[PDB]
Ligand binder design. Structure first.
Ligand SMILES: *CCC(=O)N[C@@H]1CN(c2nc(Nc3cn(C)nc3OC)c3ncn(C)c3n2)C[C@H]1F
Length: 269
């Protein structure tokens, strides 16, 4: 339990709002641990107040605090009052979804393929721990530096619907496995390769199941060669066991990262 710090209310201060939504509020703030001589920049995520067991909350937070990988965000500390407040390291460049949209003209093939490797490394770490993420998406990848991204919000779903990132078996039967995480990974890569386009844009969530049942899939991004699109398509196979494994995705995307211009055709790159 020494991985999870229980923070007093005086030990952290919210300074600036970073974002707000149905989940709650995320702040940029300071962590001032008592009996220490340092003030640490952190993000503070205050979940929306709920009418619903503390023992199971701490137990899940202990798991979130136990993740130890350069490409998965760790839970630094927690503060339980009428609300749940999660403290973690501040990722100054924000979410990868906003980043690829803001830098669509200045992102080369090497950055994109390196991100695919790092996301697959983080997800493979979780699979080795027998942990399922359930909400992998570009909005849930954070940018520590342009060459270092981390998967965020692990365990938050269990602590508490992204239809367009979900595998068909998850939509129809609410089944979540590592192989359904692979489907979400495929959609995430598609978000990256389109510089942040919305998947199935304008299509209501209730229609997605019938799109997948008919055999339709997200279209090939303009910059993607057929080798990269084949990986995305394999992530979206109906048979979950036929999808790639995260360990295989690391190998194949690391191979492409060694000659990135061969696999992504980007103007000016
Ligand atoms: C794209 C998804 C999204 O917009 N999420 C918002 C922002 N969130 C968030 N942001 C950061 N870093 C950051 C973002 N901005 C605009 N400035 C900074 O730092 C200066 C972050 N670091 C750690 N964690 C958990 C973060 N979350 C979540 C939504 F509010």
């Amino acid at each position: 339990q020494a991985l999870l710090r229980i923070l007093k209310e005086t030990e952290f201060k919210k300074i600036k709002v970073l974002g707000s939504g149905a989940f709650g509020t995320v702040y940029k703030g300071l962590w001032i641990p008592e009996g220490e001589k340092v003030k640490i920049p952190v993000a503070i995520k205050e979940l929306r107040e709920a009418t619903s067991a503390n023992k199971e909350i701490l137990d899940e937070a202990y798991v979130m605090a136990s993740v130890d990988n350069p490409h998965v965000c760790r839970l630094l500390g927690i503060c339980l009052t009428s609300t749940v407040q999660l403290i973690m390291q501040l990722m100054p460049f924000g979410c990868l979804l906003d980043y690829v949209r803001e830098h669509k003209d200045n992102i080369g093939s090497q950055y994109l393929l390196n991100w695919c490797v790092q996301i697959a490394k983080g997800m493979n770490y979780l699979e080795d721990r027998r942990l399922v993420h359930r909400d992998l998406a570009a909005r849930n990848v954070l940018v520590k530096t342009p060459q270092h991204v981390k998967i965020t919000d692990f365990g938050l779903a269990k602590l508490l619907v992204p239809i367009k990132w979900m595998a068909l078996e998850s939509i129809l039967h609410r089944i979540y496995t590592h192989q359904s995480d692979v489907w979400s990974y495929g959609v995430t890569v598609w978000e990256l390769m389109t510089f942040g386009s919305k998947p199935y844009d304008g299509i209501p969530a209730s229609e997605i199941s019938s799109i997948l049942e008919k055999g339709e899939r997200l279209p090939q991004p303009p910059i993607c060669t057929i080798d990269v699109y084949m990986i995305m398509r394999k992530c979206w196979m109906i048979d979950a066991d036929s999808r790639p494994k995260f360990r295989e995705l690391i190998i194949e995307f690391s191979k492409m990262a060694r000659d990135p211009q061969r696999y992504l055709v980007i103007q000016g790159d």
